[PDB]
Design a protein around this ligand. Structure first.
Ligand SMILES: *[C@@H]1O[C@H](CO)[C@@H](O[C@@H]2O[C@H](CO)[C@@H](O[C@@H]3O[C@H](CO)[C@@H](O)[C@H](O)[C@@H]3O)[C@H](O)[C@H]2NC(C)=O)[C@H](O)[C@H]1NC(C)=O
Ligand SMILES: *[C@@H]1O[C@H](CO)[C@@H](O[C@@H]2O[C@H](CO)[C@@H](O[C@@H]3O[C@H](CO)[C@@H](O)[C@H](O)[C@@H]3O)[C@H](O)[C@H]2NC(C)=O)[C@H](O)[C@H]1NC(C)=O
Ligand SMILES: O=c1ccn([C@@H]2O[C@H](COP(=O)(O)OP(=O)(O)O)[C@@H](O)[C@H]2O)c(=O)[nH]1
Ligand SMILES: O=c1ccn([C@@H]2O[C@H](COP(=O)(O)OP(=O)(O)O)[C@@H](O)[C@H]2O)c(=O)[nH]1
Ligand SMILES: [Mn+2]
Ligand SMILES: [Mn+2]
Lengths: 459, 459
């Protein structure tokens, strides 16, 4: 909750609230409301609310809400870092120190930058006390006249009859991580008489750079095409034929959970057979797991490559921008094309209820330098993406049936999504064993749990 | 990199270098050297060096080093943040401000905590300037007598004849992210006459919590067993039989790239058929892509569950500790068991050469509260792990033949690994087509590129 109330220190100062601004803050009170029903108005779009709590019996719901709270608290505990703690720099300290930007790998050692004591010259003695909790301090060299206590310990003191001596000594302080952890931080204390500063040294490994060999744009080397089929071999073969018309050696990975699978083969085609009805997002997951190239192109099995499906153009966007995923446009026989550019946002709910997801059509802004391309949160099922980022988000195998934006919501904030309308694929002009209704309730329960959601509006 | 040379300000101050401490710093000069050959001596362990550069013609090497540098620079550019920049807090400033811990979601708004001006009373006027680059400032409420300039702009000024007024006004300052980005930061300027502070607001989404229903421990709900087989149906059936003796309803996912696949079926078994020789790590990747449970158990197809193979115990470690992956022990028919606890570290090499990997047997420290369990970097191919972390690291499908520790190296720093000797699986007492030596050269070139490695020592 944002606290607008005056501390007693300033209760005597009058303040007129800006409603306009207080409205921008997080009030942790979200809900999901439907558009008034009836005949729709021009310009206005109809908003439909889903109450995810209605996917459970209220008895079950209380159980779910409890176990979900427990799992969330667990999640917090594993994920949160001393570097995420709110630290306020004090005013009017002699203490100069690094506030951010200081990092060491577990069990290694660094010179600490920018440590200094800017006090008054003349004072008989000058002393600074450094405290760590996951490391130890030492000096790269000893300054004549500075006395050190606790070299190679968690607590170091430096004391000097000369201020220039002390400061030069500080320029040489080293920090060492003592115990192995993968990704954490030490909140160190730098102090002198009547003054205290807290700062954080991050203890972590450099990230896996996951560098791919370019091996201009070699599409066969850079891109693998991934799809999932179920009992639609005609569409699938028509797709592969259409791909081969423009890209003869690009790999096509096909996941398939058909009951009696047909043989799918040809040069540069890889067929994966799954247990019957394992599902949609699982085949998506399977297909992506097999990609060896920097990039993966998702297409549905009922799509058809044209001359408008210029993958070079998508490759270009990913090569030249920080995007992770860039969607094309899928065009009907009717000549209408969609980019299905979607915005997803999660809004904070009351404590223990969970959050509210808002989906609405749209985008954030135009992608500078690339006309017809925008940045949004979700796109249609025709996209090129960095294989690694896709795998990193995943196609949750639990979504066995009806699912699309759930990938983009799993990816929310982690995946940098764009959408280009000029790269176009065609959509070609008994299929679900069991209760769709069940699958839907199942999905709602899953989304409720997995994302801590109470409800959602679709728009 | 380390500069120990004095700025002219202190060149006149004598310093005696501590060799033992300067020795702890990164000198960016690593190499990989073999133990002297000849007959081994009883206490020494033999260290073998691989020069990864030798896996290429001088032509190929120059090409790959260039391309690798390019891809690395790209990687840096997409990954690095203003929040990683070194900031030094100045001494003797009246400016109090948040040094870390302040974060807003893209396009959202927060009260900035801890802003104030601790100047002395008695001045005729007090003014502060706030500057942002990816956001704008406003106030939640207006203090009588404080003049605001730039409300809703990147630059805000607060001017006041009263210091208490200014500070109350500061308590109400709000920051708003203006442009949509997924994970970045704004470095703000807080300023008053003759004084400047820099601090960073992180602009990012809260992470996907990825909560699992628990469903003591329901192993069928929590754990899926994953394996990969190739023409070893007898071992595989022996494995499934052995599992079913202790765990009748735990799902077993089997990836299989046999040329002539046999039927593998029975309750709770899922068989995945792959193109012949698609490979080792790919089947591993495939199997994990199909796991729907919080946890996955990796077992080789030649393993055999006994009464020692008590998964509850592994489940327990992951439920009660921040580990992501916990390896068991694999016992030979000879009665010897291995946990294959491995340490991997990357050491900085000279500019443009790449880094050195050191693998050595060992662990970091004992896992407090769990006798016989340790924290290490790599383990044997019997382990329970959080599915999501396994998928996040990946079994690179390019490792089609011989690979094991490459998963742990891909995960290095990202995966919290442990190993318990008391959970024990038996190893039972038609090889891949192609050239081993080719695969090995291939893998060397891959590791050279992928991980920016020049060389490695095995120990
Ligand atoms: C663009 O990338 C593709 C894919 O990486 C390159 O094609 C691949 O090139 C290698 C040779 O550099 C081929 O390997 C050869 O395979 C045959 C067996 O098929 C074997 O007899 C040879 O000894 C050799 O290993 C590989 O087959 C080939 N793959 C494809 C998709 O055809 C391609 O050269 C790159 N450049 C351009 C400009 O296309
Ligand atoms: C431990 O976790 C497993 C997870 O599979 C639990 O078993 C599963 O429980 C669900 C819900 O009760 C069963 O669903 C039902 O299946 C029948 C058909 O088999 C169907 O008619 C119902 O509409 C419903 O979908 C699911 O089959 C079952 N899976 C099995 C038996 O392996 C198991 O109950 C948990 N154990 C305990 C004691 O908590
Ligand atoms: O098993 C599937 C196949 C597709 N889709 C989604 O539905 C779209 C396809 O819609 P269409 O009306 O073309 O149905 P189709 O007959 O092509 O499956 C895809 O883009 C997916 O996002 C789904 O949820 N499950
Ligand atoms: O296709 C494969 C199968 C296994 N392994 C690795 O080799 C070990 C198995 O060694 P073993 O001597 O038991 O050989 P196996 O005949 O069991 O494959 C595993 O634990 C894996 O890490 C591999 O590199 N490639
Ligand atoms: Mn369709
Ligand atoms: Mn074996």
């Amino acid at each position: 909750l944002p606290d607008l109330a005056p501390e007693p220190r300033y209760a005597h100062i009058p303040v007129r609230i800006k409603e306009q601004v207080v409205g921008l803050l997080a009030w942790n009170n979200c809900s999901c409301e439907s558009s008034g029903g009836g005949l729709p108005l021009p310009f206005q779009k109809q908003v439909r609310a889903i109450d995810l709590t209605k996917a459970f019996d209220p008895a079950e719901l209380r159980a779910a809400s409890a176990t979900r709270e427990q799992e969330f608290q667990a999640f917090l505990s594993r994920s949160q870092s001393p570097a995420d703690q709110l630290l306020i720099a004090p005013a009017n300290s002699p203490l100069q120190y690094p506030l951010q930007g200081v990092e060491v790998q577990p069990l290694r050692s660094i010179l600490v930058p920018g440590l200094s004591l800017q006090a008054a010259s003349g004072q008989e003695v000058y002393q600074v006390n450094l405290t760590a909790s996951l490391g130890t301090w030492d000096v790269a060299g000893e300054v004549t006249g500075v006395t050190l206590t606790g070299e190679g310990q968690a607590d170091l003191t430096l004391v000097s009859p000369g201020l220039d001596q002390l400061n030069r000594q500080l320029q040489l302080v080293t920090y060492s991580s003592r115990s192995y952890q993968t990704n954490t931080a030490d909140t160190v204390r730098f102090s002198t008489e009547g003054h205290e500063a807290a700062f954080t040294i991050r203890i972590r490994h450099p990230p896996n750079p996951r560098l791919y060999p370019p091996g201009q744009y070699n599409i066969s080397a850079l891109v693998t095409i991934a799809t999932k089929t179920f009992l639609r071999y005609d569409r699938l073969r028509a797709l592969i034929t259409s791909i081969r018309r423009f890209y003869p050696t690009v790999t096509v990975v096909i996941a398939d959970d058909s009951d009696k699978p047909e043989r799918v083969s040809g040069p540069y085609v890889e067929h994966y057979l799954m247990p019957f009805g394992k599902g949609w997002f699982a085949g998506r997951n399977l297909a992506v797991s097999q990609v060896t190239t920097k990039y993966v192109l998702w297409v549905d099995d009922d799509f058809v490559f044209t001359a408008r499906t210029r993958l070079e153009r998508l490759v270009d966007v990913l090569e030249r921008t920080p995007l992770d995923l860039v969607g094309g446009a899928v065009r009907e026989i009717s000549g209408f094309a969609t980019t299905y550019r979607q915005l997803l946002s999660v809004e904070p709910g009351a404590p223990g209820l969970g959050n509210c997801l808002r989906q609405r059509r749209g985008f954030h802004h135009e992608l500078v330098g690339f006309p017809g391309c925008v940045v949004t949160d979700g796109v249609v099922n025709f996209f090129l993406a960095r294989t690694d980022k896709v795998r990193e988000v995943g196609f949750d195998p639990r979504l066995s049936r009806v699912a699309h934006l759930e990938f983009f919501l799993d990816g929310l904030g982690s995946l940098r999504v764009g959408s280009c309308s000029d790269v176009v694929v065609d959509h070609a002009s008994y299929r679900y064993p069991g209760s769709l209704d069940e699958s839907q309730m199942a999905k709602h329960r899953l989304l409720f749990f997995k994302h801590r959601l109470q409800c959602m509006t679709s728009q």
